[PDB]
């Protein structure tokens, strides 16, 4: 019987397991309930505290995912099959994982908390692409990831009900980061040197839980992989969520908000499922259904407000984007997109294009979007036509809320350092046209590429190992340089140095799409409020 | 007596004067009445024929110059006074000039009408700068120039009246071109080759003659150099005119304001042309640059709609037009206006004369509009650098003054059947008096097209004398044959359409073709600015 496997927490006993990678063993404890089952009456509530258990839990498999929509826009294919649950759905999904060098460290080790991102609707932690065993290994930090309850299960809200007071996915996150500052000692963590990172959805959520008092207690230092809370999908409004959870009971056959949620506690979980779309105002890429509702509560105002109100002195972030933010989005609503053909659309696709890119704006918003976009030298250029639509989604939803955050948090008091990450995948398997696309950092962050098993290139291995030393560093140090040698310099509103990410060393560049996030950020909002 | 130089035109004699050209003798007709003398009574009412006359009249000297503002911003100074008057200000001022070529041509020789600029309160066909001996020594065609009533005198409307109708410096304008068809042929000319060319004002009014049909039967071709009708400055509505042209009145007395029209036109008639002068600067809504009191009124009747439905709704087969600009149009108009600016420093504005320069330079738009402009026109990664402040304030004037309007004007008659040629004129004067900063500034391609780098008196290098000659040969090409391409191995000048965009570099190197008029600059002007404006 091995001791290194044998931990005990709070609630009880734990059965881990040992790991293998190329560079030595990794402890995991895998499927730690953190929360009661969050099932029948507590549908829809906010987390309880897991209660102590009798015996050993056995922690050595990855638990049940939460329920969520599976993609079956190319089944089969590993592009989007490697997103989709790994493991069966169930509501019973409030688990969490730890991996730990081995033998368990003796001393406190920074933690690193994982957030996966999937549009608040989707996402696991027991995906291949998010396995913590490589980074534990070459760096030597503990690793904590979490499921979090998402769609319906985790956003939908009545706001001012009991029943259904939204952002319990949020709670859910919380919970776990509480559970993190409770028990990660007894895994070698130390529970004041925690590190969120998290990409997409997950990175709004770290955003969040830094503007939300109660979250902000409970760890050091941020990172937001092509993810900001501001984004325009990240939150909605009261009003919007109200009628959306409305919508959704209407769709499956419900009627007072209790008498409402109680009958959506009556149905099975994978029918809420069947009907996640339906739900949106309008055509649409890159909206969600059911996130995270501005209420006064967890949120007190918009991420926003709270942003450009906050004193940011003693944050350390990390935040960046990869190359084509808005690629992989237009496959999945854009008129004449597909992962099949060049999707070299037309002037008339790409205007359609444009309503739906930015949906639920006036057509003045949306001729200014045209305008700005446009080429007028080549107005009906396909390919031109292409890649002006990625950047429309890219940066209205990714790269400028980024930009934004990163700005007001340096002059806010924040030290700030930003990238752009340009590497493609060799063994990326979407069409060339999408460049590197959104979620195709992670695998590098994780060192996926030092998997034998798998097809990547000696200077990927390399690469990887480069940005497990940022990102540890980083976690360490609240910086991600290594001692001087091509420096990696900070983020500030002027001067907007950010570095390149690929196969060639750090070289250093100005301006996260400055000319364009001036359009977002500065003259858009104006505009939508005359 | 020498034959050369007497003509009969329909009104009776004329006596000319042979002027020596370095190339060769011209026959000048200048200072040749062609309206009774606005004075009076008729002042601010639509110019009356010339009665015929006995005896032979003099047209031997420029007449004097329509009564108008003086500039006095740098006294003395060379570049300020080649725009200033050179005659004695009056109101009888509706004289016409004619060059002809010396003999006298044989057979029916093309014809250019000269109008110049100067925002509709001045400017002169005396000025030294509009000399047509040089082009019709040169090129052999037939040159005439007229002046036009300028400032209240010729554009202050109450709309509606009888007594001050608008828009009688346009009719000044067109009774001229009345007079090239009915008499033009006595000097050699032909009236059925007849070609307009005007420079800012000029180029506006050239652009109203081709959208009011009773002046377009008068001309064949055009060129509009720095100025459309379709200009932000160019126009004004009703409303806006009669306001000006009441506050005029309330700020000289009349009536003992507003009114009977009848009466509080006769009380101005009754005001010394000079006490008009003096104010006129002030009836204009809001502290401006590119902007002037008194231009022509769109009322139903010179201009039955504005210039620019008339462009969109028009059909323009038949009909060829050259258009350009010249490089750095906007920088002229900054030192008459914008803060920080002078001619004697290097007008390096902070960023908060920037923003303060767009309300100036953009004036009478909403916030938000000026907001889309700071949008626009900032480099975000530079936003404070002085340098590109005031580089990009010299855009905004210029490419919301002049080069999108004429884009606009270009791309709509290309569309709609018009073989049209555009350009821009890069060469900087090694004369040029004003600072190195403000570029080839606005106004200062017209000398080279008059060929005045002949002019032996004056210094320019040899290689100027042979770039006005090319300049004055495309010109006159144009003029000739509706092309101004030489009917050989010499690089060529295609038409401008509304997708290509082709237009050429105009300077000392040969032509350079390139595409796009400030495209992107000028889709915010022409397309997302006029919709934001709405809403
Ligand atoms: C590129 O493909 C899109 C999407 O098409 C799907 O995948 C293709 C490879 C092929 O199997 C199509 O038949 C599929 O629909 C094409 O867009 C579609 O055009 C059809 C009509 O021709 C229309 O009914 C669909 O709605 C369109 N799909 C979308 C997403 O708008 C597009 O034309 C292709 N581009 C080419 C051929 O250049
Ligand atoms: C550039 O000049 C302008 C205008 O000024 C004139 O010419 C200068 C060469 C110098 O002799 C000035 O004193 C002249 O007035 C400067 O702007 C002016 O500043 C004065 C007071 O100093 C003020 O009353 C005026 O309103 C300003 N004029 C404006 C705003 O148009 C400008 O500061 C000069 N730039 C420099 C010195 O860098
Ligand atoms: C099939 O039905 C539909 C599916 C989608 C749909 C699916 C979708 C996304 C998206 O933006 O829209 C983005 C996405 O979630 C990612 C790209 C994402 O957001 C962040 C990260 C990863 C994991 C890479 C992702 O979840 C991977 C899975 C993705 C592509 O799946 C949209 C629809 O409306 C147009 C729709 O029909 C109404
Ligand atoms: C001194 O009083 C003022 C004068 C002006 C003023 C003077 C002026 C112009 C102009 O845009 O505004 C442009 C101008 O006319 C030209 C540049 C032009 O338009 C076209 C061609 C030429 C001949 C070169 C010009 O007429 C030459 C004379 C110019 C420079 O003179 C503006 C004022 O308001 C800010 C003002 O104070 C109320
Ligand atoms: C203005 O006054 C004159 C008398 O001097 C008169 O003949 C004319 O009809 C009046 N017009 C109007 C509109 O009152």
């Given at each position: 019987?091995?001791?290194?496997?044998?931990?005990?927490?709070?609630?009880?006993?734990?059965?881990?397991?040992?790991?293998?990678?190329?560079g030595?063993?990794?402890?995991?404890?895998?499927?730690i309930?953190?929360?009661?089952?969050?099932?029948?009456?507590?549908?829809?509530?906010?987390?309880?505290?897991k209660?102590?258990?009798?015996?050993?839990?056995?922690?050595?498999?990855?638990?049940?995912?939460?329920?969520?929509?599976?993609?079956?826009?190319?089944?089969?294919?590993?592009?989007?099959?490697?997103?989709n649950?790994?493991?069966?759905?169930?509501?019973?999904?409030?688990?969490?994982?730890?991996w730990?060098?081995?033998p368990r460290?003796?001393?406190?080790?920074?933690?690193?908390?994982?957030?996966?991102?999937?549009?608040?609707?989707?996402?696991?932690?027991?995906?291949?692409?998010?396995?913590?065993?490589f980074?534990?290994?070459?760096?030597?930090?503990?690793?904590?990831?979490?499921?979090?309850?998402?769609?319906?299960?985790?956003?939908?809200?009545?706001?001012?009900?009991?029943?259904?007071?939204?952002?319990?996915?949020?709670?859910?996150?919380?919970?776990?980061?509480?559970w993190?500052?409770?028990?990660?000692?007894?895994?070698?963590?130390?529970?004041?040197?925690?590190?969120?990172?998290?990409?997409?959805?997950?990175?709004?959520?770290?955003?969040?839980?830094?503007?939300?008092?109660?979250?902000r207690?409970?760890?050091?230092?941020?990172?937001?992989?092509?993810?900001?809370?501001?984004?325009?999908?990240?939150?909605?409004?009261?009003?919007?969520?109200?009628?959306?959870?409305?919508?959704?009971?209407?769709?499956?056959?419900?009627?007072?908000?209790t008498?409402?949620?109680?009958?959506?506690?009556?149905?099975?979980?994978?029918?809420?499922?069947?009907?996640?779309?339906?739900?949106?105002?309008?055509?649409?890429?890159?909206?969600?259904?059911?996130?995270?509702?501005v209420?006064?509560?967890?949120?007190?105002?918009?991420?926003?407000?709270?942003?450009?109100?906050?004193?940011?002195?003693?944050?350390?972030?990390?935040?960046?984007?990869?190359?084509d933010?808005?690629?992989?989005?237009?496959?999945?609503?854009?008129?004449?997109?597909?992962?099949?053909?060049?999707?070299?659309?037309?002037?008339?696709?790409?205007?359609?294009?444009?309503?739906?890119?930015?949906?639920?704006?006036?057509?003045?918003?949306?001729?200014?979007?045209v305008?700005?976009?446009?080429?007028?030298?080549?107005?009906?250029?396909?390919?031109?036509?292409r890649?002006?639509?990625?950047?429309?989604?890219?940066?209205?939803?990714?790269?400028?809320?980024?930009?934004?955050?990163?700005?007001?948090?340096?002059?806010?008091?924040?030290?700030?350092?930003?990238?752009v990450?340009?590497?493609?995948?060799?063994?990326?398997?979407w069409?060339?046209?999408?460049?590197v696309?959104?979620?195709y950092?992670?695998?590098?962050?994780?060192?996926?590429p030092?998997?034998?098993?798998?097809?990547?290139?000696?200077?990927?291995?390399?690469?990887?190992?480069?940005?497990?030393?940022?990102?540890?560093?980083?976690?360490?140090?609240?910086?991600?340089?290594?001692?001087?040698?091509?420096?990696?310099?900070?983020?500030?509103?002027?001067?907007?140095?950010?570095?390149?990410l690929?196969?060639?060393?750090?070289?250093?560049?100005?301006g996260?799409?400055?000319?364009?996030?001036?359009?977002?950020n500065?003259?858009?909002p104006?505009?939508?409020?005359a």
């Amino acid at each position: 019987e091995d001791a290194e496997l044998l931990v005990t927490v709070r609630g009880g006993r734990l059965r881990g397991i040992r790991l293998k990678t190329p560079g030595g063993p990794v402890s995991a404890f895998l499927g730690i309930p953190f929360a009661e089952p969050p099932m029948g009456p507590r549908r829809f509530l906010p987390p309880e505290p897991k209660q102590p258990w009798s015996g050993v839990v056995d922690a050595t498999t990855f638990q049940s995912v939460c329920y969520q929509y599976v993609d079956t826009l190319y089944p089969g294919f590993e592009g989007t099959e490697m997103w989709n649950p790994n493991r069966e759905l169930s509501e019973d999904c409030l688990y969490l994982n730890v991996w730990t060098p081995y033998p368990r460290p003796t001393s406190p080790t920074p933690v690193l908390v994982w957030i996966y991102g999937g549009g608040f609707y989707s996402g696991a932690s027991s995906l291949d692409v998010y396995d913590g065993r490589f980074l534990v290994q070459a760096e030597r930090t503990v690793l904590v990831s979490m499921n979090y309850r998402v769609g319906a299960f985790g956003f939908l809200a009545l706001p001012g009900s009991r029943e259904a007071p939204g952002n319990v996915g949020l709670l859910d996150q919380r919970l776990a980061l509480q559970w993190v500052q409770e028990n990660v000692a007894a895994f070698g963590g130390d529970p004041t040197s925690v590190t969120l990172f998290g990409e997409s959805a997950g990175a709004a959520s770290v955003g969040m839980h830094l503007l939300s008092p109660p979250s902000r207690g409970l760890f050091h230092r941020a990172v937001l992989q092509s993810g900001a809370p501001n984004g325009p999908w990240a939150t909605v409004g009261m009003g919007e969520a109200r009628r959306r959870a409305t919508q959704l009971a209407h769709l499956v056959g419900c009627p007072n908000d209790t008498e409402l949620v109680a009958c959506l506690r009556t149905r099975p979980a994978q029918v809420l499922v069947n009907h996640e779309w339906h739900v949106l105002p309008q055509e649409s890429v890159f909206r969600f259904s059911f996130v995270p509702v501005v209420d006064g509560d967890f949120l007190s105002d918009t991420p926003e407000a709270l942003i450009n109100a906050g004193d940011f002195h003693g944050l350390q972030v990390l935040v960046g984007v990869v190359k084509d933010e808005g690629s992989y989005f237009l496959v999945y609503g854009a008129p004449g997109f597909s992962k099949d053909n060049e999707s070299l659309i037309s002037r008339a696709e790409f205007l359609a294009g444009v309503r739906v890119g930015v949906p639920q704006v006036s057509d003045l918003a949306a001729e200014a979007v045209v305008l700005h976009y446009t080429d007028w030298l080549h107005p009906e250029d396909p390919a031109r036509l292409r890649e002006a639509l990625s950047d429309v989604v890219g940066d209205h939803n990714v790269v400028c809320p980024v930009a934004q955050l990163a700005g007001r948090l340096a002059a806010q008091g924040a030290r700030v350092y930003a990238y752009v990450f340009e590497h493609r995948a060799s063994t990326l398997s979407w069409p060339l046209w999408m460049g590197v696309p959104h979620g195709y950092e992670i695998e590098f962050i994780f060192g996926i590429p030092l998997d034998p098993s798998r097809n990547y290139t000696a200077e990927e291995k390399i690469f990887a190992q480069r940005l497990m030393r940022y990102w540890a560093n980083f976690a360490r140090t609240g910086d991600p340089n290594e001692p001087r040698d091509p420096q990696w310099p900070p983020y500030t509103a002027g001067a907007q140095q950010y570095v390149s990410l690929d196969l060639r060393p750090l070289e250093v560049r100005r301006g996260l799409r400055a000319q364009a996030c001036a359009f977002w950020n500065r003259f858009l909002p104006k505009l939508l409020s005359a």
